């Protein structure tokens, strides 16, 4: 009654010379089924807690596959344990072949990078009160609407420059909502694999234009989760 912890799905064979280690230090295997390669390890439990430790093990199996050449992949969300290969075939594979082939077409030769921009939220709020209009530092609804809309403008002036100036090196851009209070941009870019060096330098030359006003967090190597999504197919019962 060991199930299968699944890490990702790849279009090509992965050789056994690619040594890999996963959750609980289990060895990681590949398993080809009709031209789809599933990277997996033996699951001891049915469920794994998303502890910091386990999330790192999961993330590194896929990153290590990418470092070894297997850059096109659907990466799976942490925790995916299925009972047996029959269930992998009937539920995960058979109904999804076409979407998985399309998806491998879109990702081939491409990579996800991310850009998170932070500013000093407090400082830029007080700096904005000192601007062109300056009230005294109910109709409380009106005034809290006017600050919130003029704050958005001040963010969006920064954001827009980064978006106009990086978008030309990318095939697709997906923006997500701020995680922290200081975060003003959280964007994933899908770029040709060989655009990374120029992208990296472009990010840096844009930042130089804003002086020490921003913190930039650029991740240049990650499994492509934002751009590898599978919509639901019909399942008969």
Numbering used by the authors: 2 to 138, 151 to 250
What does the original paper state about this entry?
To further investigate the putative GVs of Anabaena sp. PCC 7120 from the structural point of view, all Gvp proteins, except for GvpA and GvpC, were successfully overexpressed, purified and applied to crystal screening; however, only the crystal structure of GvpF was eventually solved at 2.55 Å resolution in the space group C2221. Anabaena sp. PCC 7120 GvpF is composed of two structurally separated domains, both of which display a fold in α + β class, followed by a C-terminal tail inserted into the middle area of the two domains. Further structural analysis showed that the N-domain of GvpF displays an architecture in which a six-stranded β-sheet (β1-β6) is sandwiched by two α-helices (α1-α2) and the helix η1, whereas the C-domain adopts a modified ferredoxin fold owing to an extension region consisting of three consecutive helices (α4, α5 and the N-terminal segment of α6). Moreover, the additional C-terminal tail provides an interface for the N-domain and C-domain to pack against each other, resulting in the structural stability and correct folding of GvpF. Superposition of the two structures showed a very similar structure, except that GvpF of Anabaena sp. PCC 7120 possesses a shorter helix α5 in the C-domain. Besides, structure-based multiple-sequence alignment revealed that GvpF proteins are highly conserved among diverse species of cyanobacteria. It indicated that Anabaena sp. PCC 7120 GvpF might also function as a structural protein involved in forming GVs as that of M. aeruginosa PCC 7806. Moreover, structural combined with enzymatic investigations suggested that GvpF and GvpN are structurally and enzymatically conserved, respectively.
